[PDB]
Structure formats: C-alpha cells, structure tokens
Design an enzyme around this catalytic site. Structure first.
Site, PDB file in Angstrom:
ATOM      1  N   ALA A  25       0.846  -1.189   0.000  1.00 23.02           N
ATOM      2  CA  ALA A  25       0.000   0.000   0.000  1.00 23.02           C
ATOM      3  C   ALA A  25       0.881   1.239   0.000  1.00 23.02           C
ATOM      4  O   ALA A  25       1.902   1.283   0.693  1.00 23.02           O
ATOM      5  CB  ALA A  25      -0.931   0.004   1.210  1.00 23.02           C
ATOM      6  N   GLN A  60       1.230   5.778  -1.390  1.00 27.16           N
ATOM      7  CA  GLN A  60       0.664   7.100  -1.615  1.00 27.16           C
ATOM      8  C   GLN A  60      -0.359   7.122  -2.759  1.00 27.16           C
ATOM      9  O   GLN A  60      -1.276   7.944  -2.769  1.00 27.16           O
ATOM     10  CB  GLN A  60       1.820   8.072  -1.888  1.00 27.16           C
ATOM     11  CG  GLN A  60       1.454   9.433  -2.463  1.00 27.16           C
ATOM     12  CD  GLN A  60       2.689  10.260  -2.788  1.00 27.16           C
ATOM     13  OE1 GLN A  60       3.819   9.785  -2.647  1.00 27.16           O
ATOM     14  NE2 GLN A  60       2.480  11.500  -3.222  1.00 27.16           N
ATOM     15  N   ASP A  66      11.291   5.435 -13.350  1.00 26.91           N
ATOM     16  CA  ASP A  66      11.442   5.008 -11.955  1.00 26.91           C
ATOM     17  C   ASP A  66      12.161   3.658 -11.779  1.00 26.91           C
ATOM     18  O   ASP A  66      11.623   2.716 -11.187  1.00 26.91           O
ATOM     19  CB  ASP A  66      10.087   5.005 -11.239  1.00 26.91           C
ATOM     20  CG  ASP A  66      10.229   5.120  -9.738  1.00 26.91           C
ATOM     21  OD1 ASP A  66      11.332   5.508  -9.283  1.00 26.91           O
ATOM     22  OD2 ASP A  66       9.247   4.825  -9.020  1.00 26.91           O
TER      23      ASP A  66
END
Ligand SMILES: COc1cc(-c2nn(C(C)C)c3ncnc(N)c23)ccc1NC(=O)OC(C)(C)C
Ligand SMILES: [Ca+2]
Ligand SMILES: [Ca+2]
Ligand SMILES: [Cl-]
Length: 435
Positions: free
Chosen positions: A191, A193, A302
């Site tokens: 889990a 942002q 990323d």
C-alpha cells in the site's frame, strides 16, 4: 488440411476451450493468434487451444531436445537450472547465423565449475549437418544419436535433453477491458501514496496481481491511452500486462510474480545466499529489459530494485514502466532530471547504475547515513558512492560510467546488456571450433 500435435497437457478453464493430453493430434480449423480453433482427433470436439501448446506434426519442435527462439544466453540460463546435469543438451536456432542451428551442452571444470559450451551446426548444401567436417549426418537426430554414444571431440558425451517447463497459458480471448465482478482481491501485498497491490483471482481460474489506483488527478482517458501503448511492450523481461478495469477507481491486472520485489528478495534468507555471478545474472536480465525499452524509444522514469519483480524460477521482470509520466526517489535520480526535470533513456542509465549498487549490496539503501539534500550537494562536488567489498572492480567501472555528469557520455543499455551477459566469458570463447 493442417494437423498439429500437443507439446504439453492442457486443461480447459474457459467456456469454449478444449482439454487435451500431450501427444494428442488435432485438426486446425482457424489460425488467429494466441488462440486457435481446432478439432481433437481423440474426442472429435471443436474448440479453442493455445497456439503455443502445439506445433505441426513431426516438425522440429515436436522433438524433446529442440528449443525454438532461445538465445545463447537463454540456453545457458536454462541448462544451468536445477534438474539438469553433465551432458544435458539442447539444439536451438542460431542467434548469430539466422536459418541455422546451434548445440549447447552442460560441462564441468574445477577452475570454473558447471558451465555451458556452444557449437555451431553447419548446414550442408546437400542437406546434411556437421559440427566437425570429419563427421556428417543426414538428420539432426542422427547428429544427436552419435554424440550421445561418445564425446568424439566435444566437451561432454550427450546425456539427457534439457529440462523444459510448460509455458504460461494465454489470457482469455478479447478480455482487455473487464468488469470488476471478475476479480476477487484476496490479499493486500503493498500500500502506498497512490494505491495498493493485491493478490487476486480472475473468474475462479487464474491467479493474478491487481494494482488499485486511488482516484488521483490521473485523467481516466489519458491513463488508458498510455495503457494501450504499454500493452504493446511485450517482452520476456517486462511484466505481462493482462487487463484493465475502466471505471474509477481504476484497476491494473498483471501476471503474479511469486517472489515479489527484487528488493525484498535480496533481503530475504534465500536472497542472502545468492552468489555474485547470480547477482550479475539478475543485472543482465534487467539490462536486457531496458535495452528493449531503449529500442522502442520509451522511458521508464522510476528504475530501482523495488520496481523489479522476481518469478519463482528467479527470472527478473521490469514493472511500473512509464507509469510515472501519468501520475521521493532522488537517490535514484540523475541531476538533469532533478534540476531541470529532464527525463531521458540516459537518466534511466544513471538509475540503472544505482540499482546495480542496490543489487550488489543485497538491497542496502543507496547513500547510507546521508539525507536527500546532503546527497544533492555531494554530487555537484563530484561525490560518488565508494566500491563495496564484494563488488568486482570491472562491475564498478560500469556503475561509474553510468554516473557520468553529461548524459551523452553515458553508455547505452544495448552495450550494457552485451557486457553483463558475457561478464565471465571472453569473446573468442563464446563458441567452440572443432576440427
Ligand atoms: C498488478 O500490477 C502490478 C503489480 C506489481 C506487483 N507488486 N508485487 C509486490 C512487490 C507488492 C507483486 N507481486 C507479485 N506480482 C506482482 N505483479 C506484483 C507491480 C507492478 C504492477 N503494475 C505495473 O507494473 O503497471 C504497468 C504494467 C501498467 C506498467
Ligand atoms: Ca541499431
Ligand atoms: Ca570460438
Ligand atoms: Cl476430421
């Protein structure tokens, strides 16, 4: 009248697909991609079959010792995998001489350990095959049978054909957009942002992973446009994108990777026992993935250990590619991207260099003790992370070349992949020449 034969067992799980055993012959009624329409000669039923579970009768792919579409490096990875032994072998399509075949055999020497050697099989003009001009054969099976009864100049006598696994069964036909009802999200894995990751189930039959995007600023329309581009980036070293749920909150469905993130894996019991050439093999797989992305003129944005996934058989796969264009990690970020927001395949190379350090330190945080702004000031002075104890000197130069100030001075993923794939092999030693 096309007749094919099953290479593996398959058990139907959909409405109109057929079940069959390995060896079953079927009549092709319709070729149309991952799913074909056929009639089983054993049951006389008409239905759908996975195209990649069959091959035309008595063709090369029917043989246990034959492997289609395997690179020299894939052959070596496959042979050095558990369940195999000395003389474990395979015949495969040549990667460098297209239209021709190569032979790969498992070997041993105490200076190096278990290895894979490669021989080019030269196609004759009469239609024969040879590795050594002294010895010629009419069929590849004749070739195989011979070197199976003695070395006759090879490194090993051929023992058993390489281990194979059943391929992934393809996604349901025309099921790109699916309704939420098809999913049972059974366990949360992560889990953050921007949402969660769940272990799920599609229509009671298939294990999958689901990414739940919380309704951010992310335009529904604009996301799905990019998702349709992502769908076209299919490569063995990128995670398989299966489906999508179209109404907010948007759901993303991929294949399930049993060992989760590379970061978590390196920090586990099993990870800690991986020797250095294994760590280097991981790196090479990832470079392969990025080289593909580079090829297709795409950007990841990323790259790091937490966004690499590990399969049960230790295949590494790139995840979350390009997802950041649509929606912290400055320790993974190149300066030109930090200062000016300039994101290129070159800035990814910078990130790959940091990931290399992540890998070789078994998951350790980059720039330890340092805070983000401390790190920023350090770089502009010319600071770079030092070389850890276990890291080989030449592996370090690669990281350092990745961390050039000028983006253009950074090497390509094409070159990186090529270096890393043959890190322990000299160019002259790639193949073997036998008189
Ligand atoms: C369902 O979607 C994902 C799942 C995972 C994932 N995370 N984990 C753990 C580490 C929380 C997983 N474990 C097993 N399988 C997975 N797919 C994941 C990663 C990434 C994605 N999504 C993803 O990579 O999005 C693209 C393919 C559209 C770029
Ligand atoms: Ca080129
Ligand atoms: Ca050679
Ligand atoms: Cl028939």
């Amino acid at each position: 009248r096309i007749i094919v034969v099953a290479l593996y067992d398959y058990e139907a799980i959909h409405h109109e697909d057929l079940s069959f055993q390995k060896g079953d012959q079927m009549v092709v009624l319709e070729e149309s991609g991952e799913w074909w329409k056929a009639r089983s000669l054993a049951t006389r039923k008409e239905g759908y079959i996975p195209s990649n579970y069959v091959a035309r009768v008595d063709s090369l792919e029917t043989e246990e010792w034959f492997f289609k579409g395997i690179s020299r490096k894939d052959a070596e990875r496959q042979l050095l995998a558990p369940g195999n032994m000395l003389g474990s072998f395979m015949i495969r399509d040549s990667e460098t001489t297209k239209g021709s075949y190569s032979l790969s055999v498992r070997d041993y020497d105490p200076r190096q350990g278990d290895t894979v050697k490669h021989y080019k099989i030269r196609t004759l003009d009469n239609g024969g095959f040879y590795i050594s001009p002294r010895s010629t054969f009419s069929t590849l099976q004749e070739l195989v049978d011979h070197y199976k009864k003695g070395n006759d100049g090879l490194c090993q006598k051929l023992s058993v054909p390489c281990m194979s696994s059943k391929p992934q069964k393809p996604w349901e036909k025309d099921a790109w957009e699916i309704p939420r009802e098809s999913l049972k999200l059974e366990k949360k894995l992560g889990a953050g942002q921007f949402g969660e990751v769940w272990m799920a189930t599609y229509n009671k039959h298939t294990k999958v992973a689901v990414k739940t995007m919380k309704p951010g600023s992310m335009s529904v329309e604009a996301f799905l446009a990019e998702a349709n581009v992502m769908k076209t980036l299919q490569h063995d070293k990128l995670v398989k994108l299966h489906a999508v749920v179209t109404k907010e909150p948007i759901y993303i469905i991929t294949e399930f990777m049993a060992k989760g993130s590379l970061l978590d894996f390196l920090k586990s019991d099993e990870g800690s026992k991986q020797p250095l050439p294994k760590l280097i093999d991981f790196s090479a797989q990832i470079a392969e993935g990025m080289a593909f992305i580079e090829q297709r003129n795409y950007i990841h944005r990323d790259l790091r250990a937490a966004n690499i996934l590990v399969s049960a058989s230790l295949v590494c796969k790139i995840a979350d590619f390009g997802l950041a264009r649509v929606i912290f990690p400055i320790k993974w970020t190149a300066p030109e991207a930090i200062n000016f927001g300039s994101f290129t395949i070159k800035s990814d190379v910078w990130s790959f260099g940091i990931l290399l350090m992540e890998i070789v330190t078994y998951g350790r945080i980059p720039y330890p003790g340092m805070s983000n702004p401390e790190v920023i000031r350090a770089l502009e002075r010319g600071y770079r992370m030092p070389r850890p104890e276990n890291c080989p000197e030449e592996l370090y130069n690669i990281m350092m070349r990745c961390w050039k100030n000028r983006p253009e001075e950074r090497p390509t993923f094409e070159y990186i992949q090529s270096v890393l794939d043959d890190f322990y092999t000299a160019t002259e030693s790639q193949y073997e020449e036998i008189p």
